[PDB]
């Protein structure tokens, strides 16, 4: 039953999102002072990367837990479970941060409060931080429901075209099932128009430039 899988994806998503959606929205009034922004900008590139690296690592463990709890995934061979997570975990982290993004004031939720891209200046990757805000702004524009983002992030993960898959049929099958679920659920709710406004490799290319940098922080 497609309906079991849908309820499973939504359950796991509800249980594995690091921050509650009510808490992010209640916190949108809480914005970093220019003093606080100065404090972050003053930090060494080493310090800012270590502290962001730490946050990213923690987030990936929530995507790992999201994958493990969503049944059909645990039935794939361990090799394929590893290939899909390493290929998609960060892309899933990126999609998720659009919930912690306020398009009203181009702010993202970060270590307790909200701030703009100028907070991350010490990373010395303004291009990349701009890519991340732009992508979050585009995604916020869809006004996803929790169910829509749960099902979308499941398809970000269950992708039969990832290189290095052993049982490429068993992944196609799960992906095809998630597609039927997602397409049916959008069509039944007249939400099918958002499929045009979804990014293409654009999740892949976004982080390519800077990602293997994280290995020397851990």
Judged by the rule CB under 6 A, the positions of this chain that interact with ligand LK8 are: 18, 52, 55-56, 58-59, 90, 93-94, 97, 108, 110, 120, 123, 128-129, 132, 207, 210-211, 214
- Least distance in angstroms from the C-beta of 120 to ligand LK8: 6
Q: Which of residues 73 and 135 has its CB atom nearest to ligand LK8 in the complex?
A: 135
Q: Which of residues 18 and 140 has its CB atom nearest to ligand LK8 in the complex?
A: 18
Q: Which of residues 37 and 160 has its CB atom nearest to ligand LK8 in the complex?
A: 37
- In sequence order, what are the residues at sequence separation of 6 or more whose Cβ sits closer than 8 angstroms to the Cβ of residue 218? 53, 57
- Least distance in angstroms from the C-beta of 152 to ligand LK8: 16
Q: What is the DSSP letter of 31?
A: B
Q: How many angstroms separate the CA atoms of 27 and 24, rounded?
A: 5
Cα distances from 16 to residues 10, 40, 119, 155, in angstroms, run 10, 29, 27, 16
**Nearest alpha-carbon partner for 18 in 70, 82, 63:** 63
- Least distance in angstroms from the C-beta of 212 to ligand LK8: 9
- In sequence order, what are the residues at sequence separation of 6 or more whose Cβ sits closer than 8 angstroms to the Cβ of residue 155? 175, 178, 179, 182
- Least distance in angstroms from the C-beta of 138 to ligand LK8: 14
Q: Which of residues 28 and 210 has its CB atom nearest to ligand LK8 in the complex?
A: 210
Q: Which of residues 76 and 92 has its CB atom nearest to ligand LK8 in the complex?
A: 92
183: helix, coil or strand? helix
């Amino acid at each position: 039953e497609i309906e079991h899988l849908v309820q499973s994806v939504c359950k796991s998503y509800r249980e594995t999102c690091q921050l509650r959606l009510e808490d992010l929205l209640r916190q949108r009034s809480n914005i970093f002072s220019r003093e606080e922004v100065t404090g972050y900008q003053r930090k060494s590139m080493w310090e800012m990367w270590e502290r962001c690296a730490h946050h990213l690592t923690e987030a990936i463990q929530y995507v790992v837990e999201f994958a493990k709890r969503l049944s059909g995934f645990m039935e794939l061979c361990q090799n394929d479970q590893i290939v899909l997570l390493k290929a998609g975990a960060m892309e899933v982290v990126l999609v998720r941060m659009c919930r912690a993004y306020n398009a009203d004031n181009r702010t993202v939720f970060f270590e307790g409060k909200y701030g703009g891209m100028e907070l991350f200046r010490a990373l010395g990757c303004s291009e990349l931080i701009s890519s991340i805000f732009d992508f979050s702004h585009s995604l916020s524009a869809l006004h996803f429901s929790e169910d829509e983002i749960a099902l979308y992030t499941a398809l970000v993960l269950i992708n039969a075209h990832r290189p290095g898959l052993q049982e490429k049929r068993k992944v196609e099958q799960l992906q095809y099932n998630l597609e039927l679920a997602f397409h049916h659920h959008l069509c039944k709710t007249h939400r099918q128009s958002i499929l045009a406004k979804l990014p293409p490799g654009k999740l892949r290319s976004l982080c390519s430039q800077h990602v293997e940098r994280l290995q020397i922080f851990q």
